[PDB]
Amino acid sequence: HMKIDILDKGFVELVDVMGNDLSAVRAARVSRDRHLIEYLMKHGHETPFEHIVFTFHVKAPIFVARQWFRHRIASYNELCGRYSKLSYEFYIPSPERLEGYKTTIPPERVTEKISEIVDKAYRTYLELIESGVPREVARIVLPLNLYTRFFWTVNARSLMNFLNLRADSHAQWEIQQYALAIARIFKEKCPWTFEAFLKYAYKGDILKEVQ
Amino acid sequence: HHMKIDILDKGFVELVDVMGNDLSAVRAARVSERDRHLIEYLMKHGHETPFEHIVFTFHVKAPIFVARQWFRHRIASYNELCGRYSKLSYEFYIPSPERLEGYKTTIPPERVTEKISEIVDKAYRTYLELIESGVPREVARIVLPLNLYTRFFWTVNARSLMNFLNLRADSHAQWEIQQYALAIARIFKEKCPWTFEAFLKYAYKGDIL
Amino acid sequence: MKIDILDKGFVELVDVMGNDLSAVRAARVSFERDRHLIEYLMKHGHETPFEHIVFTFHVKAPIFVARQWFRHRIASYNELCGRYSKLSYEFYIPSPERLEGYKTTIPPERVTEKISEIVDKAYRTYLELIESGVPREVARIVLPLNLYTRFFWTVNARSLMNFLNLRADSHAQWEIQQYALAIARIFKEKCPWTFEAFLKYAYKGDILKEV
Amino acid sequence: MKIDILDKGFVELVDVMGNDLSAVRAARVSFDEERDRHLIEYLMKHGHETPFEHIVFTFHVKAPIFVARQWFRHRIASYNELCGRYSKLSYEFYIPSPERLEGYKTTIPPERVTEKISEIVDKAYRTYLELIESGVPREVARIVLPLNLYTRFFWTVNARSLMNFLNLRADSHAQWEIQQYALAIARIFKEKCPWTFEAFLKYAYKGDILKEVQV
Ligand SMILES: Cc1cc2nc3c(=O)[nH]c(=O)nc-3n(C[C@H](O)[C@H](O)[C@H](O)COP(=O)(O)OP(=O)(O)OC[C@H]3O[C@@H](n4cnc5c(N)ncnc54)[C@H](O)[C@@H]3O)c2cc1C
Ligand SMILES: Cc1cc2nc3c(=O)[nH]c(=O)nc-3n(C[C@H](O)[C@H](O)[C@H](O)COP(=O)(O)OP(=O)(O)OC[C@H]3O[C@@H](n4cnc5c(N)ncnc54)[C@H](O)[C@@H]3O)c2cc1C
Ligand SMILES: Cc1cc2nc3c(=O)[nH]c(=O)nc-3n(C[C@H](O)[C@H](O)[C@H](O)COP(=O)(O)OP(=O)(O)OC[C@H]3O[C@@H](n4cnc5c(N)ncnc54)[C@H](O)[C@@H]3O)c2cc1C
Ligand SMILES: Cc1cc2nc3c(=O)[nH]c(=O)nc-3n(C[C@H](O)[C@H](O)[C@H](O)COP(=O)(O)OP(=O)(O)OC[C@H]3O[C@@H](n4cnc5c(N)ncnc54)[C@H](O)[C@@H]3O)c2cc1C
Ligand SMILES: O=c1ccn([C@H]2C[C@H](O)[C@@H](COP(=O)(O)O)O2)c(=O)[nH]1
Ligand SMILES: O=c1ccn([C@H]2C[C@H](O)[C@@H](COP(=O)(O)O)O2)c(=O)[nH]1
Ligand SMILES: O=c1ccn([C@H]2C[C@H](O)[C@@H](COP(=O)(O)O)O2)c(=O)[nH]1
Ligand SMILES: O=c1ccn([C@H]2C[C@H](O)[C@@H](COP(=O)(O)O)O2)c(=O)[nH]1
């Protein structure tokens, strides 16, 4: 499966895809083809693109999932922290993450202070579980940089809205990174639609600079 | 894959595409038989979100009065033949005499059927005449009756599909869309046998499946 | 508030939850610089705050119009049942002025007449079928697409602006354009700041800038 | 109408469009108590749910992130939440009472569970603040914050999607914390739409708690 690594331990993997560029074409005609996709994209006939659908498997920090899951025109199924024992996996920003901000302490110490809290919080979590505290309560001490996993099924129209909002400099850098991988898979599977999207409908800044 | 079921006199439901299978729900429930048991468990308890990861595209030819009921299902995608821009074909649902089974009628069912054909023919000829006169199609078509056939593509996931079958695969629904819902059910069954059996066994609220 | 549309149609306001401040409260999560914030939300595509303004309309429209209208899925509908009601002798007959700009072979007043004729013969066939013991749900299939229907429509400001982007526009059928113009006027009356910022920043259609 | 939930949370009613009769008028498409109340029961009993979509609520809700993350899986509703990338997060966190763990056999007194939870919260928060003073951006500084951090949001939901919410959350299979919130949602729905809430419970409600707990 197309699997792209994101952040220190994250990823976006493509589980499944229904259709391709021609799925939008046939829906539009209800039945020259590449010019029809450009045409549709240029004039804002977005509905035929709903007949292309993807399922992704995504491993992401909770603070990224939280932003992602705001996209309501999609289907999600996520790892359960109430009944599963949660794995020791946390997003630790690289020193380069703080490139462009003037800091009081070196970026290696910032990375160290994050790692410190993470380790303290996880130990506590494990101590609570061992003492017979239910997992659903014990987990509340875990930080927002804990990794979670989920399935995401989303059609090309909603995906393009996701890319307008997340493959953009105003989105938090971490989700941008996920959106770039989504765009990469989208492009591999639906090249005509992806290029037409960038040319006529894409509202973000980064995908027109990041090849 | 590909399946086509003919409905009414000139209608059809055709399966254009599918994403996933019964294991797509299982994979999703688990974020990846014990697997068949899981599908039944999900169905039994109304854990329906996993079934959203199974997706169908259908191509449907149905009368307008059927499509109008159908398109009330908002959790889906539609693209439909455009009467504003295309010259519309002479195809109309004429009920067979058997459609009036049960109903004691004043005129024999054949005459009912013939009365329907005649008004339809008259409406269509007027439509054509207006078009020949230079009347925009979007105006001319307003004389056409609700039994005119339209075509559309329908993309729907298994969860929304089960909602559709609950409502339309049911005696309280009009006979004509019931017939379509039976074709939708048969294709669903072919492609997702486990989910469909579990559905019928545990979740299905209608009465004709 | 009620606006008559076409020959026998209308759009009336049944209810509204909120006003421009409803969006402001939502965007701030609390409870002019308020009006600056509405324009800020609109200019930047921060549309979700407007979802917390909600209208309910009562609309009487021909079925062909209602079918275009009912394509707008992010809203709630309840329509008159034709399966069990005796349907009312009301049909949209176009004015002769409806064919202005079109050079036709028969007079526009004659087009109008041919439309009423069919309406009348169709309705009479329907009544004949009903009187014969044909169930209404079968008899009504002979009725033309210009038959008037009624529905309740509950829609939020955001979905309403989408609707006006697509329907308050010359590419939409004139008939639904007229209805969209009425929706816009009721929208403007209830939420003038949002309506004004919408027109300035986000509105994609053409006719609301003309009329 | 504002109801306190948990230790620092609440459900507050911001607005409402309609009442029981808004569903009746939608169902009839038309702009008599016993007749109207009968209609509501008939709709609910026969699963004609769509008329209830014409009633709509806006809540202001303050809840811990682990609760918000469950809630926000309800996609047929509208949401605006306070922003952690750009606001300085307030020192407010949910600390379970010892009574939250009564009837779990634990190796330590539930008071020590509270102290343990409270301890990490303080550390995480202190680290967060430490990072902010350093010039680390908030969007990054907050990732050390635990899942019991309180958040606030606006929720706009129609009575239909609200009743779904209650079936699933006003139910003992949902996490106890969200149950508490759902009972508050339910009491407010009941106050504003008594006939629909009662018909709902008699005919349509699949949860277990609203039939045992009054309001
Ligand atoms: C840079 C940035 C900053 C953000 N800051 C905040 C913040 O401070 N606080 C906060 O709470 N959120 C914030 N968000 C999240 C944002 O408000 C949306 O919830 C999220 O981006 C999903 O966008 P969407 O609603 O367009 O997508 P979806 O929910 O997938 O909806 C897709 C589309 O369908 C439509 N739609 C779906 N449901 C409805 C509906 N119920 N009514 C009307 N139309 C609907 C809309 O046209 C929408 O564009 C931010 C997002 C970005 C990119
Ligand atoms: C026998 C029969 C008679 C009918 N008679 C009439 C009539 O007289 N008049 C009339 O107008 N309609 C009538 N309908 C149509 C009916 O009111 C629904 O519009 C239609 O069945 C679509 O159902 P749905 O909303 O469940 O499906 P969808 O609209 O696809 O929605 C699927 C599910 O998602 C949810 N959902 C989607 N959108 C929302 C939302 N905005 N708010 C809350 N929840 C939402 C609900 O849980 C719903 O079950 C009839 C249907 C049947 C089967
Ligand atoms: C001039 C004109 C010509 C048209 N011609 C045709 C035609 O020939 N054939 C035809 O079938 N239709 C046609 N339409 C209808 C059109 O394709 C849409 O069905 C209609 O305009 C509703 O728009 P919407 O989907 O944006 O609105 P809604 O359905 O209310 O959706 C609102 C927003 O939410 C989002 N959304 C809601 N559900 C989904 C979903 N399941 N997936 C992805 N995003 C979603 C989208 O972002 C959308 O913009 C035409 C419309 C116009 C104005
Ligand atoms: C006890 C409990 C345990 C849970 N465990 C988990 C877990 O382990 N992992 C996890 O990821 N989630 C879990 N959830 C969340 C659950 O998966 C649902 O996302 C949540 O309950 C929201 O339900 P909903 O989809 O019915 O509501 P909404 O999303 O508001 O939808 C309301 C209705 O509209 C319909 N609808 C809306 N969108 C669609 C669509 N795209 N396709 C088809 N129908 C649609 C459905 O009819 C639905 O009933 C759990 C919930 C509960 C109560
Ligand atoms: O009772 C539950 C369990 C899980 N989830 C959803 C919310 C999150 O997106 C994800 C994991 O939540 P937790 O199990 O960690 O609470 O699944 C719920 O909505 N309700
Ligand atoms: O301008 C248009 C054209 C088409 N349609 C949708 C509505 C119907 O479901 C279908 C066919 O409509 P007509 O072109 O026949 O009006 O496409 C619209 O919504 N607006
Ligand atoms: O069985 C029915 C009856 C009505 N309707 C909806 C579709 C239309 O939007 C409106 C009126 O439909 P008719 O009863 O006229 O078919 O109500 C359905 O979806 N199914
Ligand atoms: O860039 C952003 C900022 C916020 N949010 C949403 C997600 C949460 O529901 C809430 C707060 O997110 P944080 O700012 O705390 O990440 O608003 C986003 O979706 N994207």
XYZ file of N, CA and C in Angstrom, chain D residues 40-48 199 203-204:
36
model
N -47.125 14.288 17.238
C -45.739 14.072 17.702
C -45.488 12.598 18.059
N -46.410 11.964 18.804
C -46.260 10.576 19.139
C -46.284 9.662 17.906
N -47.140 9.991 16.939
C -47.267 9.187 15.718
C -46.001 9.316 14.871
N -45.497 10.517 14.723
C -44.241 10.676 14.023
C -43.131 9.807 14.660
N -42.957 9.930 15.964
C -41.869 9.262 16.682
C -42.034 7.741 16.639
N -43.243 7.274 16.893
C -43.567 5.858 16.827
C -43.302 5.241 15.454
N -43.653 5.932 14.375
C -43.493 5.360 13.026
C -42.221 5.798 12.374
N -41.327 6.399 13.139
C -40.004 6.742 12.612
C -39.931 7.823 11.563
N -40.952 8.681 11.480
C -40.911 9.873 10.609
C -40.209 11.028 11.332
N -42.208 11.627 23.898
C -42.561 10.699 22.816
C -41.295 9.936 22.443
N -41.048 5.934 22.639
C -41.109 5.284 21.320
C -39.788 5.033 20.613
N -38.789 5.863 20.876
C -37.628 5.920 20.005
C -36.284 5.778 20.726
